[PDB]
Write a protein that binds this ligand. Sequence first.
Ligand code: NA
Ligand code: NA
Ligand code: NA
Lengths: 206, 206, 206
Amino acid sequence: TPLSIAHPWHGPVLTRDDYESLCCYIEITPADSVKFELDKETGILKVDRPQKFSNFCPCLYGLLPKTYCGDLSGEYSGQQSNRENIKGDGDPLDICVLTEKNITQGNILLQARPIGGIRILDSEEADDKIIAVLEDDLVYGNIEDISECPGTVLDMIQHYFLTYKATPESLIQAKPAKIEIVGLYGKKEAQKVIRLAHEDYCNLFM
Amino acid sequence: KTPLSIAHPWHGPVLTRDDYESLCCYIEITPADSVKFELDKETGILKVDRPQKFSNFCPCLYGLLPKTYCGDLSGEYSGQQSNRENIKGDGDPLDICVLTEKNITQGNILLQARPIGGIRILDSEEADDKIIAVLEDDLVYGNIEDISECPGTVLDMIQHYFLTYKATPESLIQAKPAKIEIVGLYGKKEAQKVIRLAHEDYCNLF
Amino acid sequence: KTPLSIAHPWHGPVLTRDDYESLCCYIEITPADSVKFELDKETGILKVDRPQKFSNFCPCLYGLLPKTYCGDLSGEYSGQQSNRENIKGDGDPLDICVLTEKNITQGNILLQARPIGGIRILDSEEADDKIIAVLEDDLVYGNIEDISECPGTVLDMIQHYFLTYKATPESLIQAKPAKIEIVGLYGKKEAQKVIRLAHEDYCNLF
Ligand code: NA
Ligand code: NA
Ligand code: NA
């Protein structure tokens, strides 16, 4: 009998069907004007910072329980991008959940099925974003691979990370992007990226 | 004596302190939601069960009663009250609909409400009672004491929700019989007994 | 080291890490709310205290400061600073109003805020101080260091709230004297002292 609410990062079971579907903790929705992040110490959702510019997060954004972007995650990202000395960013694995429904509040769990991801390198750190579709979603529910995902939605998501920290001076001066989008990958690779981040988590917290 | 962690919303709060005249309730779904939320029993975190399949919103505050379980005693009584055999409990905490004039947009909250009645529902030989209660000190519903004093238009809205939120168009076009059976409504005293029985089911199981 | 459960918002989080230059705050009420929420001390779950009685919304992010307690030391300083005797603490955590330009619709969150002052309020010999703070990195209020740099229209808005949210029409038509006493405002250093004392009250209580 669970007497207390479990920490969203350590509590939930990540997967029960060998990563075909995942339990996800949502931190940010399109409705938010600030960036929320799960407070590691307390397990309470916390304001990280207000949105600096004119962006909203264009999907449900959160973390995967029982994942940690660590040694194995960094090495695979480095291998997959032909890069050496790539380390993990030290946080849980980021996931973007596609849904046609309106969710206005974060601090929730949901079931989502991975279809791919965006491999991002941010100054020698792997900052992968898993892309998943909400289970039984009326629009995205039957998408099984990222190649079946509307390219306009992927561009929206890439645009968010490319601009949400870009100063006007940097955009007018055409300064190169501070994050490197190495490209997209599909379901199987995403499941591998999740598998590795889970092993990183298991070794450090279990 | 100092709670260092947040209590599980199902097991933690005290159900009643005044012999079921008012109840502490945990809210999972509001009229503002477009998905059906449900408390994850294992973790105590609010979780998306499924998106709304059709064109319904939940027309009230919907949630559960702490320290209740729809078990053996609940099933036998529901069968007794509907004169139907082999009626079992649905295995979940007891459902409650809270009437309020105010706009509540987020779930994952507690509130105090007063029961005034309930809807006896059978879903394929399972008791799926919905307790009807009024938010304490609500400016419109606060003084309502029995379901007979509740506006019938609001009760029809609530009955319509459960009669349609899982009804496919084909089943409606072919006039297939409803998959849930509304056996009728009951008043305050009967509602308090259903809560009492569901509370005993919980105590015997834990 | 693995926090398995979500921490109680009042007892769990660390109040300050920079000697009260910035504070961790737990938000109970936002401008979007139509009811008054309050952290339930026993369970640590956000709970509806009562609906808004009249035509008010809370004009800022409103909550409590973790690990604070408005006790004896808090009352004595309030009495000294207001030249009134026998002022006791109100027994709750220290209240805080957070100013932000952004729209936050959901409570039950943590955030970092920098105090700039506060409102000293006496409610029938009880200190009901309201700390005034600005959301860290807020695009508008972020650089405000003292309450004297805060627009008086915002302060009037906050004072108007506490002066009217419990004022019946009859009491206003008959111009009956206010039930709460606004003794005045204070600046950054003094607010830090009020928080320091309230933190000491809490530590001495446990
Ligand atoms: Na990351
Ligand atoms: Na049920
Ligand atoms: Na107070």
